[PDB]
């Protein structure tokens, strides 16, 4: 797990998953996660959030 | 603001920003946000997180 070096980066992404859950309801397999980097000692953690339909919830 | 219809989607992304702050420290202009959709009544909220260098923090 290359994201284990910090131990917080993956803690925040999983948090946004529970966060979107507190306000909505989606699975972890629906949210993608991908880290990138720039030529200047910089990183870029991007995460896709595929939300499904919704209507039964009011 | 097309993301104002739900009022929670943008609340979770801003939360992950503060979350990465509680465990680290970055600006909102460093994290990108982009929503997408599929041909099946589905959405895809992707957000880039450009993290800067780090060392002064122990």
From Swiss-Prot, chains A, B:
Disruption phenotype: In a minCDE operon disruption (minC-minD-minE), cells divide not only at midpoint but also at their poles, yielding small minicells and long rods. Loss of polar localization of several polar-localized proteins including GroEL-GroES, TnaA and YqjD. Keywords: Cell cycle, Cell division. It comes from the Bacteria. One of its GO terms (cellular component) is cytosol. One of its GO terms (molecular function) is ATPase activator activity. One of its GO terms (biological process) is regulation of division septum assembly. Disulfide bonds: none annotated. Prevents the cell division inhibition by proteins MinC and MinD at internal division sites while permitting inhibition at polar sites. This ensures cell division at the proper site by restricting the formation of a division septum at the midpoint of the long axis of the cell. Belongs to the MinE family. This is Cell division topological specificity factor. It comes from Escherichia coli (strain K12). The chain holds residues 31 to 88 of 88 of the full protein.
